[PDB]
Amino acid sequence: MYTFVVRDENSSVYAEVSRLLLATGQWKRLRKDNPRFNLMLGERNRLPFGRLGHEPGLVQLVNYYRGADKLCRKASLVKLIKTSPELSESCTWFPESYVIYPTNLTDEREVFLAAYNRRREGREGNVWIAKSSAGAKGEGILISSEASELLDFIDEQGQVHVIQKYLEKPLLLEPGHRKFDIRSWVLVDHLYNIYLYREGVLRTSSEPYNSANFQDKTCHLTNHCIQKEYSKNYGRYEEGNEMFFEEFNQYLMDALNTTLENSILLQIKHIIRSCLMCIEPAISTKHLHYQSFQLFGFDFMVDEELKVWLIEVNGAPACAQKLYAELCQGIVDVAISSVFPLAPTSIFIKLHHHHHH
Amino acid sequence: MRECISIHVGQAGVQIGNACWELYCLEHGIQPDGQMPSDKTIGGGDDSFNTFFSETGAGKHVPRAVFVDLEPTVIDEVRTGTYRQLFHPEQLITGKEDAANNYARGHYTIGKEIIDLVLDRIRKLADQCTGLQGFLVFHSFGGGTGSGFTSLLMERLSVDYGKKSKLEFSIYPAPQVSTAVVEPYNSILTTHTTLEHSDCAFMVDNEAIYDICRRNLDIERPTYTNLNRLISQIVSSITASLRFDGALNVDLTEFQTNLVPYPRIHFPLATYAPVISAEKAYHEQLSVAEITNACFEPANQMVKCDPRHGKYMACCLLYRGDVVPKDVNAAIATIKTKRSIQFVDWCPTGFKVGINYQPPTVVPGGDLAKVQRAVCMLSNTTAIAEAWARLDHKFDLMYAKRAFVHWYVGEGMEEGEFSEAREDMAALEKDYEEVGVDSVEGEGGEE
Amino acid sequence: MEVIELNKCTSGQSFEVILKPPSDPSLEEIQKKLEAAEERRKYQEAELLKHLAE
Amino acid sequence: MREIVHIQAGQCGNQIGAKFWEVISDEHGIDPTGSYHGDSDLQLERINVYYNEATGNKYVPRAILVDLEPGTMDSVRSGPFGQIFRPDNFVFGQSGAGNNWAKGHYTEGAELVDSVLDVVRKESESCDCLQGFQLTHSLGGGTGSGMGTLLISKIREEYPDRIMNTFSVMPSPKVSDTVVEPYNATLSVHQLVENTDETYCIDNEALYDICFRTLKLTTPTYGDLNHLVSATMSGVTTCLRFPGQLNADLRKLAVNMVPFPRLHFFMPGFAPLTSLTVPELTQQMFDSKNMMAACDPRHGRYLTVAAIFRGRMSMKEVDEQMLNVQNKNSSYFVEWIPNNVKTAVCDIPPRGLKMSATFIGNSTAIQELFKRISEQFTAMFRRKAFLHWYTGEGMDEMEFTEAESNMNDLVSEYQQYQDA
Ligand SMILES: Nc1nc2c(ncn2[C@@H]2O[C@H](COP(=O)(O)OP(=O)(O)OP(=O)(O)O)[C@@H](O)[C@H]2O)c(=O)[nH]1
Ligand SMILES: Nc1ncnc2c1ncn2[C@@H]1O[C@H](COP(=O)(O)OP(=O)(O)CP(=O)(O)O)[C@@H](O)[C@H]1O
Ligand SMILES: Nc1nc2c(ncn2[C@@H]2O[C@H](COP(=O)(O)OP(=O)(O)O)[C@@H](O)[C@H]2O)c(=O)[nH]1
Ligand SMILES: [Ca+2]
Ligand SMILES: [Ca+2]
Ligand SMILES: [Ca+2]
Ligand SMILES: [Cl-]
Ligand SMILES: [Mg+2]
Ligand SMILES: [Mg+2]
Ligand SMILES: [Mg+2]
Ligand SMILES: [Mg+2]
């Protein structure tokens, strides 16, 4: 009999993992502060990694990678990319970004303004987007073509922000002429196998994309909460403004005579692997006294040339309603039962590539 | 030459001491009867080994050491064992009844009655020194004597020897070999009262040594004998600079200068490689790069913790055997490009390196194989604070119910001492966090 | 990667390699604490002996 | 922390004590004449904990035999190892205690107790460093219960900084001599709560049930019960009697086992008990059928546990199995005392066995035992039944009311940590 504790009651993904583990009849849930557990489903903040793996006779496993926040914060991600040679300042799949600290607090303000003025003099599109990790859902964001408004916006805030080039030529679904972003779920197990869930989801706008007005952030921000609240056409095209890969692939074939795999997923898989292999030495638990796995939500934008751009990485994703059962069983199969065997046609794509040069 | 006096307190302190002095005699060519044929100055001198050994007219080389325990069975074994002739009775001090795993009994009740004798015996040694540097103090955290008597001794040593340095070798408790439920209490109580009196302390977690013995020496159920021979090798590595010709860490003061820029944060992490089984039939000897790389693996550290997730204030590499600087620097270059090694902003990113050409000495019939080269890394990393968090958490669980507290109050300790000690530990954890961690951007989950 | 303070002797050598630069209670008091705890043991014992006398 | 002085009082106390001395004498290679004929140095290393040495390499138990009538001690003196005891250490009266705590504590016992203390003092005086005392007695009779607890109070007065440990046989209606046992046991338990550091609670019902249900003894005698007790006492004192790191003296044991001063009542257990591998030993030692307080461990929580394994066996496997018990039933070990199970192993197994294990548990379930006694007390006390036997010795009813209250308080303190 294996034992586990639950320390994040708000997690929908792990509430379901918990339910599944119990139904195997081979897992017991301990009081959250009982130390004799096999598995910790940890809290989101200040998870006590330092107390893990000091229990004789217990192999211990936790559902977070210590150090993974570097990938999963707005400003940390920008810095990780700019300062890591194999991602780099010239990284082609991440939008040009600058870390900006509000003046009331290093800061890349002048570097940003320098690039901004260069684009202005060159007649190039010059729309940027100010955001941070503190952007509670739909708020805390500004899209503007004026550097002054962007910087002023940030100075009124109290936490680090990123200013990032705003993608002015997004791929637009028809009918509706509308924006979307792609969410991919990725599970990294204790051996640092990287598994891409075969099902992703497009979170769509239900409002026609309008470049002549970045003030009304409904056709511009694809957040579910924003769409669900301010969009008067919410759900007109797809239930909950969620389009799944079967339909999106069919659209790509009918309309663009291409596939999801070729035009988009090849890039998505490259970006995911590149990101995770970059931080592997910093976070691997390979020779550690406890082991980690973690579920990530990667979010992508696609432009009208079918180039894929990474927007962010979510360290504690939820899942789409209809995908919970399958993803959560997958987590049990590959992240947990792999370490704690019970007494297909995987739902995942294992990401691995070994080019010789 | 400046002398160092070693003080061994309680069972752990004494047994580890015995292992260290045996190893020192083998490294220096001193026989169990104290004679040292290679030493051509009969009856005295000021060689580097004289930092740890005085000399009698008859040519006996006598450890500058005092052994103290509140019951007699462990020190009796020193009195009758292989190296008995090394020591005279005035260096071996025993009480009749021990501190019963109770810091308060060791510190207040029994300590009050033996402390003056112990100081007289240390003074006798000090009076032999032309230029006493200070003290190396060996003890467990968990025992009543190792915890309670040590903190009393340390306090009186600061009074009687104010200008002298004091280093510790401290055994941190591990249930796999521990003998008392109250060891977290004793550990926190002694750490609180000792913090201001100690200039540099090397903590060894029995959990880490135990597992190294299991994993690398293929010992199924390690004994204190197995543990202490390994600990003795690490201690010898650390003190070698005091006992042999060299220019790095050549006096106690230099340990603090090089390893402890911030006085409360005085607990360097030791990491040691390679540990190889003597029973191993076929073994490929490990290179400078291989043993240096091993210094960044938690599996070889004296305390299991993760330095990738803290910051360094200082790093010393101490090599023994066939090592030249060029290979050390090639090794370090490579390791920089592969490992997570972040220093605090107010210290330089670098390594102080000492090489002694003599490979490690192994005790005949020991568990450790002879190797061509070995290294001990001493790094002051905030990651070691994970060990304080573990201990403080166990303390908190028991103290919230006042479990076992009556045993301490019964020896005349006030309950307030628990909370005072624990607050001091809370501030310590905070100091480590402040020095070691950059704020993580906050968020407005379910994303 | 600068090597500095290289020192050599017959028994070994030492040096430093830099990758990057930067950016008590008195005897009286101890005595009093030990005596105060003794007074407390003495008091607790006196209380016990009084209870046994009753 | 070297010498222990042993006292055995009353019929039960002397009968179990005699058996204890026969059993550990055999283990230490001591024959009935006090001569050593062993083949292992482990046998003698700590022999001084329980035995004094005499001229001619003779070993004499540091044992004092107390009773208010001569019968049982005459039998002891005629027994197998009877000649091994110090003749001057038999201290006895003639009038008996009539199964009456008041006679043991206040009248008959009061007249004899100074002469017992004289012998205790003589034994203590020849100790290099006395650890403390161990007393064997029943709580249901008059001498062991009443006089035994009187002795404990006087010993504490004279040696207040020494440890007091008892092996205390708790009465049961199923294995009973008289109806007043619950009165005697209630009066005694209050004395034990105050004046002992460690009390092993041995329920005669548990002993009986083990003999009948498990050992398949159709009609157990006190002798059969005492064989179990013997074996258990040998097991629980192994750590005091042989070289070792854990619980090697009475105070270190107390510090490991007693987190609150009044909760010092332990359930002992023994394995094997059969009509053997490490796993089997380990499962049987934690088995309620192997414990001797007639309390269900699953009805409470363990504050602390000491396990002692004896025989040649893999320490690796021992450690593995003990971890498996705690990790698989972690809910029965209070979470606010980390690492509260300590394990020792001694190479020397008891007679007739290749390996064995002994269990000492400080469990809140022990409240069931005090509850049973409390119920039996009240059934009679509500009608003041049988009280004339006590009032005739000068006691008043208020002392009974106070003892009952004290024991109900003990029960309440266990329950508090059961819900903690
Ligand atoms: N590494 C190592 N640890 C030891 C040794 N002896 C004891 N310990 C550890 O030290 C702690 C117990 O303290 P001891 O040193 O035995 O106690 P003491 O200082 O003699 O104090 P009292 O016996 O309480 O008077 C436990 O955590 C043991 O595991 C040893 O020889 N080597
Ligand atoms: N550089 C850019 N170009 C175009 N659109 C962008 C953009 N950056 C953000 N967006 C829009 O804003 C959304 C993401 O904003 P952001 O990622 O800060 O919100 P979020 O962190 O709440 C998403 P999640 O729920 O995955 O965490 C995308 O869905 C996209 O529609
Ligand atoms: N286990 C056991 N219990 C006994 C023995 N003799 C008496 N008893 C129990 O002890 C209690 C009676 O006390 P007893 O020792 O005979 O009275 P005392 O001589 O006045 O101390 C009852 O609970 C009996 O069941 C014995 O030899 N073994
Ligand atoms: Ca000389
Ligand atoms: Ca000082
Ligand atoms: Ca009379
Ligand atoms: Cl001085
Ligand atoms: Mg997004
Ligand atoms: Mg986000
Ligand atoms: Mg000791
Ligand atoms: Mg009788």
Residue-range domains of chain B with CATH? 1-268 (3.40.50.1440), 269-383 (3.30.1330.20), 384-447 (1.10.287.600)
Distance set, CA A109 to CA A126, B317, B441 (Å): 16, 41, 18
Question: B216, B275 in Cβ contact below 8 A?
Answer: yes
Looking only at the bridges linking them, the beta strands covering A39-41 and A2-6 are: parallel
| Residues of chain D neighbouring A27 (CB-CB closer than 8 A) | none
Query: Cα distance from D312 to chain B (closest Cα, Å)?
Result: 14
Q: Report the alpha-carbon distance of residue C20 to residue B351 in Å, rounded.
A: 11
For the domain that residue A154 is a member of, what is the CATH number?
3.30.1490.20
Q: Two tokens at A345?
A: 């046609």
Chosen domain end from A124, A145, A168: A168
Q: DSSP for A179-233?
A: -EEEEEEEEE-TT--EEEES--EEEE-SS---TT-SSSTTSS---HHHHHHH-TT
Q: Do D255 and B180 touch (CB under 8 A)?
A: yes
Q: How far is C44 from chain D (nearest CA, A)?
A: 11
Helix axes B111-126, C27-53, angle to 10 degrees: 150
For residue D291, report the phi and psi dihedrals to the nearest 5 degrees.
Answer: -100, 160
Q: Which long-range contacts (CB under 8 A, 24 or more apart) does B118-124 make?
A: B118/B66, B118/B68, B118/B93, B118/B153, B119/B156, B119/B160, B121/B66, B121/B90, B121/B91, B121/B93, B122/B5, B122/B7, B122/B66, B122/B157, B123/B160, B124/B90
Structure tokens at D374: 């409390």
Looking at domain D1-259, which of 3.40.50.1440, 2.40.50.180, 3.30.390.50, 1.20.1440.130 is its CATH number? 3.40.50.1440
The H or E element containing residue D344 is strand D341-346
Indicate the number of domains in chain A.
3
Q: Which chains touch A (3 or more CB pairs under 8 A)?
A: B, D
C39 contacts B413 by C-beta, under 8 angstroms: no
C-alpha angle A56/B228/D241, rounded to 5°?
75
Contact between D327 and A58 using a beta-carbon 8 Å cutoff: yes
Residue where a domain stops, chosen among A138, A168, A198: A168
Q: Which ligand is nearest to the CA of B179?
A: 1
Give the distance from CA B70 to its chain's centroid: 21
Which residue, A75, A279, A311, is CA-closest to B438? A75
Given CB atoms, is A225 within the 8 Å cutoff of chain B? no
Q: Which fold has domain D366-420?
A: Helix Hairpins (1.10.287)
Residue A342's identity, in one-letter code, is L
Nearest residue of chain B to residue A288 (CA atoms): B298
Ligand 6 centre distance from Cα of residue A230 (Å): 100
Beta carbons of A44 and A73 less than 8 angstroms apart: no
Q: How far apart are CA D231 and CA D351, in angstroms?
A: 9
Residues of A in contact with B440 (CB under 8 A): 69, 73, 76
Q: Same domain, yes or no, for A288 and A354?
A: yes
The conformation of residue A131, written as its DSSP 8-state character, comes to E
A184 touches chain B (CB under 8 A): no
- Residue A158 belongs to what domain range? 96-168
Q: Letter for the amino acid at D116?
A: V
Contacts of B179 (CB under 8 A, 6+ apart): B101, B142, B143, D245, D246, D252, D342
| Contact between residue B427 and residue B195 where contact means Cβ atoms under 8 Å apart | no
Whole-Å CA distances, B385 to A50, B238, B426, D189: 9, 21, 11, 47
Nearest CA-CA partner of D12 in D183, D181, D262: D181
Answer for the pair A132, A105: CB distance below 8 angstroms, yes or no. Answer: no
d(CA D89, CA D118) in angstroms, rounded, equals 10
Non-local (6+) Cβ contacts of A215 within 8 A are: none
Evaluate whether chains C and B are touching (3 or more beta carbon pairs less than 8 Å apart).
Answer: yes
The phi and psi torsions of C10 (rounded to 5 degrees) equal -55, -30
Owner of token pair 């046609």? A345
Answer yes or no: are the C-beta atoms of A58 and A30 closer than 8 Å. no
* Statement to judge: residues A71 and A178 lie in one domain: yes
A187 and A316 share one domain: yes
The residues of B that are catalytic are 254
Cα(D110) to ligand 6 centroid in Å equals 9
Spans of all domains in chain D: 1-259, 260-365, 366-420
Tokens of D387: 């009280």
Choose from A28, A36, A55, A340 for mutation: most chain D CBs within 10 A. Answer: A36
Establish whether the linkage from the previous residue to B382 is cis, with ω within 30° of 0. no
Resolution of this model in Å is 1.8
Side chain identity at residue A150, one-letter code: L
Q: Which residues of B are annotated as a binding site for Mg(2+)?
A: 71
Residue B84's CB: how many other CB atoms inside 10 A? 13
Q: Which chains touch B (3 or more CB pairs under 8 A)?
A: A, C, D
Residues found in chain A: 357
**3-state SS, residue D296:** coil
d(CA A350, CA B4): 60
Positions of E strands within A239-315:
242-244, 291-292, 294-302, 308-314
Tell me, yes or no, if the two domains D1-259 and D260-365 fold the same way: no
Residue D388: count other Cβ atoms within 10 Å of its Cβ: 9
d(CA D304, CA D259): 8
Tokens of A316: 């504690």
Instruction: Tell me, yes or no, if A47 comes closer than 8 A to chain B by beta carbon.
Output: no
Contact (Cβ atoms closer than 8 angstroms) between residue A224 and residue A208: no
> Chain D partners of B402 at a C-beta cutoff of 8 Å?
260
Asked if residues D6 and D62 have their Cβ atoms less than 8 Å apart, the reply is: yes
Cis peptide before B274 (omega within 30 of 0): yes
Report the distance separating Cα B424 and Cα D11, nearest Å: 56
Query: Atom 12 in ligand 2: which residue has the minimum CA distance?
Result: A221
Q: Is the domain covering D260-365 a CATH 3.30.1330.20 domain?
A: yes
* DSSP bridge pairs for B158: none
Residue A141's CB is within 10 A of a number of other CB atoms, namely: 18
Examine the domain organization and report whether A39 and A187 are in the same domain. no
The answer to whether D307 and D253 are in contact (CB under 8 A) is no
Q: Which atom of ligand 2 is nearest to the CA of A220?
A: 31
Handedness of CA A186, A191, A193, A198 (dihedral sign): negative
Partner-chain contact A34 D330, CB within 8 Å: yes
- State how far residue C21 is from chain B, nearest Cα, in angstroms: 5
Give the side-chain half-sphere CA count within 13 A for B103.
Answer: 31
Q: A112 and A234: one domain?
A: no
The answer on A194 and A141 residing in a single domain is no
CB contact under 8 A, D319 and A56: yes
CATH number, domain with residue A354: 3.30.470.20
Cβ of B170 less than 6 Å from ligand 1 = no
- Give the orientation angle of helix D367-381 with respect to helix D181-195, to 10 degrees: 130
Among protein residues, the one whose CA lies closest to atom 7 of ligand 3: D12
How far apart are alpha carbons A159 and A155 in whole angstroms?
Answer: 9
Q: What distance in Å separates residue D295's CA from the closest CA in chain A?
A: 25
Solving technique for this entry? Answer: X-ray
CA of B11 to the centre of ligand 1 (A): 5
Strands (E), chain A: 2-6, 27-29, 39-41, 61-62, 97-100, 128-131, 142-144, 161-165, 180-188, 194-197, 201-204, 242-244, 291-292, 294-302, 308-314, 348-350
Do residues B30 and B61 touch, judged by C-beta distance below 8 A?
yes
List CB contacts of D55: < 8 A, sequence separation 6 or more: none
3-state class (DSSP) for residue A248: helix
Q: Could you tell me which residues come within 8 angstroms of residue A79 by beta carbon, excluding any fewer than 6 positions away?
A: A99
- Residue in B285, B361, B350, B266 with CA at minimum distance from that of residue B314: B350
Gap between the Cα atoms of B183 and D391, Å rounded: 50
A56 touches chain D (CB under 8 A): yes
Signed CA dihedral, A218, A219, A223, A228: sign only = positive
